[model samples]
Target chain A: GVGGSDERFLCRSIRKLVYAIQIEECEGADQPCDFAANFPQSYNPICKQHYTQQTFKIPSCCKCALKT
Target chain B: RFLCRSIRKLVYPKQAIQIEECEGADQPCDFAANFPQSYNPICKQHYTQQTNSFKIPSCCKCALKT
Candidate 1:
């Protein structure tokens, strides 16, 4: 099983926007799934008036391996 | 049942704090459990002209897994 939890991520805001979570600590079944690399993803959150897409980095896949 | 989860967030010094999230029992090994995210206006960085969208994970649920 893949074990992981949400974590605080660095984000860019304009006026009154707050940064949320994506993922942080990850664990594998037997081996350890340490966070070493990241994958960028586009998110369209919200400001106060308009919304736009922003780039954010999230943890990649696994090190040990995932069940298929 | 073969999984467990908890809520986590950054507090200070770029540290992550674990809070209570989905508590109960595991569904199964074939369950797709991931923290669902919600876009909220809680960032302070200025992006674009008038656009600032921050992604935040709120809850955890077992949705349809393909």
Candidate 2:
């Protein structure tokens, strides 16, 4: 349901968050774009040195041309 | 992409505790780093001191931020 060729560059948000994933985005695109995740993975991110299952959603690339 | 991914999961310690790693860490933007944290899980004499005063990272990774 998501596939397109979109030229994008690295863009990280100017925000600081401890113990949380920093927000990043893709910029410099010719059309409307959104960061698309590759896939969801079962991540057991260590919290307090103990394994805790968490949903890991990672961005893969930018997808241009949304529903328009 | 790299600075925020999984390195290890479902870890069970037999000899020594293991540290989690950041998956797909690359250069020029993202890097592998660590954060310090402590917990009060099971307690004993030396075990209490190790787990209490011991410094370790809960989740460690690096990225460009400001």
Candidate 3:
């Protein structure tokens, strides 16, 4: 019963959940970007790169207008 | 936009979700009894004594009791 339809479904659900939360948080950013509170430390570099390249809309949530 | 809240409600019906005993007594029992169907074992010995001792509703979906 492991590693088939259910596994795929669960993984998909988790991905959607994470993406949804990120989108919500990014939209909530008003004054300044709170990097630590929003995403994992390891993702800072990736987020920064996306921000610099103006490709932040790739995930829609990676766009923090106040990011510095 | 936020889409998962509705998706979650559909995939996880409030009534179908429940906690019950493992129904089997074998050590390292069947995957269904030991862990969730969707649980991909990324680490060795993922389910330990601590996880097996608990019976939370969420754990019921996975083979592990925790």
Top TM-score model: 2
Of the true interface contacts, the fraction found in model 1 is: 0.00
As a whole number from 0 to 100, the lDDT of residue A30 in candidate 2 is 38
| Candidates 1 onward: DockQ, in order | 0.05, 0.04, 0.02
All candidates' TM-scores? 0.19, 0.22, 0.14
lDDT of 3 by residue, B1-66 (tens): 110111111112221222122222222322222223433422111111112132121111111222
The second chain of candidate 2 has a TM-score of: 0.28
lDDT string for model 1 (A22-67, tens) is 3332232233222212211332211111122223333311112222
Between prediction 1 and prediction 2, the one with superior lDDT is 2
Instruction: Give me the candidate number with maximum lDDT.
Output: 2
Docking class of 2: incorrect
DockQ value of candidate 1:
0.05
Clashing residue pairs in candidate 2 (N, C-alpha, C atoms within 3 angstroms)? none
TM-score of 2: 0.22
Instruction: Estimate the lDDT of model 1.
Output: 0.25
Error of 2 at B61 (Å): 1.8
Local accuracy of candidate 3 as per-residue lDDT tens digits, A1-68:
12233232111111122421221122222333322243333332122111111102222122222122
Which stretches of model 2 miss by more than 4 angstroms? Answer: A1-68, B4-15, B21-52
Cα lDDT of all candidates, in order? 0.25, 0.26, 0.21
Ranking by lDDT: 2, 1, 3
Which is the winner by DockQ between candidate 1 and candidate 2?
A: 1
